[PDB]
Write an enzyme that holds these catalytic residues in place. Structure first.
Site, PDB file in Angstrom:
ATOM      1  N   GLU A  34      35.220  27.459 -37.818  1.00 47.90           N
ATOM      2  CA  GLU A  34      34.633  28.676 -38.425  1.00 47.90           C
ATOM      3  C   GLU A  34      34.479  29.747 -37.346  1.00 47.90           C
ATOM      4  O   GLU A  34      34.133  29.417 -36.233  1.00 47.90           O
ATOM      5  CB  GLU A  34      33.230  28.335 -38.951  1.00 47.90           C
ATOM      6  N   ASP A  35      34.711  31.026 -37.671  1.00 45.74           N
ATOM      7  CA  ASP A  35      34.475  32.097 -36.696  1.00 45.74           C
ATOM      8  C   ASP A  35      32.976  32.321 -36.394  1.00 45.74           C
ATOM      9  O   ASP A  35      32.593  32.477 -35.239  1.00 45.74           O
ATOM     10  CB  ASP A  35      35.154  33.414 -37.130  1.00 45.74           C
ATOM     11  N   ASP A  37      26.061  32.202 -39.661  1.00 51.46           N
ATOM     12  CA  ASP A  37      24.794  32.909 -39.668  1.00 51.46           C
ATOM     13  C   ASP A  37      23.804  32.189 -40.587  1.00 51.46           C
ATOM     14  O   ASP A  37      23.056  31.337 -40.114  1.00 51.46           O
ATOM     15  CB  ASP A  37      24.954  34.423 -39.951  1.00 51.46           C
ATOM     16  N   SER A  38      23.825  32.474 -41.886  1.00 53.24           N
ATOM     17  CA  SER A  38      22.941  31.755 -42.821  1.00 53.24           C
ATOM     18  C   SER A  38      23.281  30.245 -42.912  1.00 53.24           C
ATOM     19  O   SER A  38      22.383  29.402 -43.037  1.00 53.24           O
ATOM     20  CB  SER A  38      22.961  32.410 -44.213  1.00 53.24           C
ATOM     21  N   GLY A  39      24.578  29.922 -42.842  1.00 51.97           N
ATOM     22  CA  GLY A  39      25.060  28.555 -43.038  1.00 51.97           C
ATOM     23  C   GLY A  39      25.221  28.146 -44.504  1.00 51.97           C
ATOM     24  O   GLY A  39      25.664  27.032 -44.768  1.00 51.97           O
ATOM     25  N   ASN A  40      24.874  29.042 -45.443  1.00 52.66           N
ATOM     26  CA  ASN A  40      24.781  28.709 -46.875  1.00 52.66           C
ATOM     27  C   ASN A  40      26.095  28.179 -47.445  1.00 52.66           C
ATOM     28  O   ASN A  40      26.127  27.133 -48.100  1.00 52.66           O
ATOM     29  CB  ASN A  40      24.320  29.919 -47.725  1.00 52.66           C
ATOM     30  N   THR A  41      27.168  28.913 -47.181  1.00 54.00           N
ATOM     31  CA  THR A  41      28.499  28.572 -47.671  1.00 54.00           C
ATOM     32  C   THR A  41      29.038  27.302 -47.009  1.00 54.00           C
ATOM     33  O   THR A  41      29.597  26.418 -47.675  1.00 54.00           O
ATOM     34  CB  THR A  41      29.452  29.759 -47.444  1.00 54.00           C
ATOM     35  N   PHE A  88      25.582  43.625 -35.365  1.00 58.64           N
ATOM     36  CA  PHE A  88      26.588  44.035 -36.333  1.00 58.64           C
ATOM     37  C   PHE A  88      27.944  43.987 -35.625  1.00 58.64           C
ATOM     38  O   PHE A  88      28.290  44.896 -34.879  1.00 58.64           O
ATOM     39  CB  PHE A  88      26.257  45.440 -36.843  1.00 58.64           C
ATOM     40  N   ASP A 137      35.622  40.679 -40.184  1.00 56.81           N
ATOM     41  CA  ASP A 137      35.858  42.011 -40.738  1.00 56.81           C
ATOM     42  C   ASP A 137      34.579  42.828 -40.964  1.00 56.81           C
ATOM     43  O   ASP A 137      33.489  42.270 -41.081  1.00 56.81           O
ATOM     44  CB  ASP A 137      36.556  41.902 -42.094  1.00 56.81           C
ATOM     45  N   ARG A 157      39.760  42.786 -38.455  1.00 59.69           N
ATOM     46  CA  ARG A 157      39.986  41.338 -38.216  1.00 59.69           C
ATOM     47  C   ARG A 157      40.970  41.104 -37.079  1.00 59.69           C
ATOM     48  O   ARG A 157      40.928  40.078 -36.411  1.00 59.69           O
ATOM     49  CB  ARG A 157      40.524  40.608 -39.462  1.00 59.69           C
TER      50      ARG A 157
END
Lengths: 171, 164, 166, 164
Positions: free
Chosen positions: B89-90, B93-97, B142, B149, B155
């Protein structure tokens, strides 16, 4: 080379008997979801389409329908449902359960999405063939382990459109 | 209105990829084969660079996915059961997905399942996903570049930039 | 049952990507924005390397198709194609049969322009005359792997292109 | 809004016999017929119609979304060299069907034809050839028999007008 016919098909369950069973399944499903306002019916392609089409027309209330395509090998999702599952009452609709292997993997994947409820409905069941203990809430016909086609079930992508269920019989 | 400024240079990334590869190669030294799986579109650049540094019998694959709901737009083509699998994974952050993807893949009973991320924003974490290999640990900036992207652009930047 | 032998080094590929980028950048000098679309899985390493050398507002996307047996779309592009400048990026062209179908599918969506770039071309294999705008290396019909190209899913991660000696 | 029957289940049934006789005559000489429906709207019509079609019949499905027409799920079955019948519940603008027909023509079927249960000719925005039509209808706001309003009413056994 000319290829002579090598088998024929003989009716095992008539269109009328299937119609009767659908009336029964619908009574059971409608009773089961009495206190539910919305139901999402999910069919597995390609085999569930005929059964889903007939059954869904007998289910009461706010009904939505959707489909997934999975491979029978890990179970890979070729097409996922388009609807959200979380917090919804979900009924998986399948033409035939034999081993249970595919349905069990589909059940497990959907459960991750935390539906309010998840139930399974199969028109045909070969209990003899079961390899994993998947809970099936609604069952139409219990059948022996015969070579069968029709009403959504193919042989070599033939016979899916027969309005009855037939066994394929050699000459 | 906005511009971009370099935050982590291509050269810095290149050095960290060698560090990641050594950790990964040491971790899978005894493995028969490794399957590396990236999530589209963000993982492709990182995966392309990283997989070239990983030793042994390596296969690569990709998935596309878009609360407990997830939709699989493209599943992996490769078998998972009984294999060593590394999710690449790049940015986490949240880790949700990632957590949803990890859970789905665990059902397929890989021999092992691990996660490598180039960038980690630990302050953003919303679910406890286990991360095995991390390149850079960063504040909640940010950022774009190296696969990441903003509204589908940037990207292809060879560096990681901060959007200013 | 097999070994490998280097045919094009990673250094030679790097040099050729500079040449390709120069051609592409000059071709799209006047373009507002470019969509680069790669075919999975074979194009991913080539795409990653090439896109980092392409100027302007660049977007990347991917499709997965079955090999020509019809060419079926296993995963379509996520981006809109209509009215975009689009560059299809492929690792290898041989028969041309698959890329020809992919090109046709994308033409149906009415892009502003469509061009094709292949890192490797085996012209003695061509069965259909698909127009290719940018070509890296013209190679003989050898059994090849590396830089995205597999043999039985192995070797995609080789940083060079290699011949398999069976 | 409320709903009011416009075409009864019995009327649909009678028309499916008419359509089946036309299709069966048209394909009497066919080695393989492949009937292809678009998800989700065509499923009910397909289920009913396919059961009345003679000979070697296979069915398959595509999911497309309109903006370009993107293929979310292609057919699984082979198209090349086969007789193919696209089966649709309703044609109004024709935009999506025209793009689908074009994509399938690329695969060089032996023949390609289109059957729709309902046609709203006054809504046509593209000239798509339709070989078999059930009912020609005015531009009524309709649901049922696979056609939804905001995903509802697909399971109505008849075609209803929505009266707001």
């Amino acid at each position: 080379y000319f290829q002579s016919m090598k088998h024929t098909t003989e009716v095992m369950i008539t269109a009328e008997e299937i119609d009767q069973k659908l009336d029964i399944l619908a009574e059971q499903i409608n009773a089961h979801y009495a206190d539910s306002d919305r139901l999402l019916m999910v069919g597995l392609l390609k085999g569930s389409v005929v059964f889903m089409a007939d059954l869904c027309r007998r289910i009461k209330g706010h009904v939505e329908i959707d489909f997934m395509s999975v491979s029978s090998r890990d179970v890979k999702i070729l097409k996922d449902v388009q609807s959200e599952i979380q917090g919804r009452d979900v009924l998986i609709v399948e033409d035939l359960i034999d081993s249970g292997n595919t349905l069990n993997k589909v059940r497990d994947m959907l459960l991750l999405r935390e539906p309010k409820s998840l139930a399974l409905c199969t028109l045909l069941d070969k209990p003899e063939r079961r390899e994993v203990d998947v809970p099936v809430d609604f069952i139409g016909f219990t059948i022996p382990d015969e070579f069968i086609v029709g009403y959504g079930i193919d042989y070599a992508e033939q016979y899916r459109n027969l309005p009855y269920i037939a066994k394929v019989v050699p000459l």
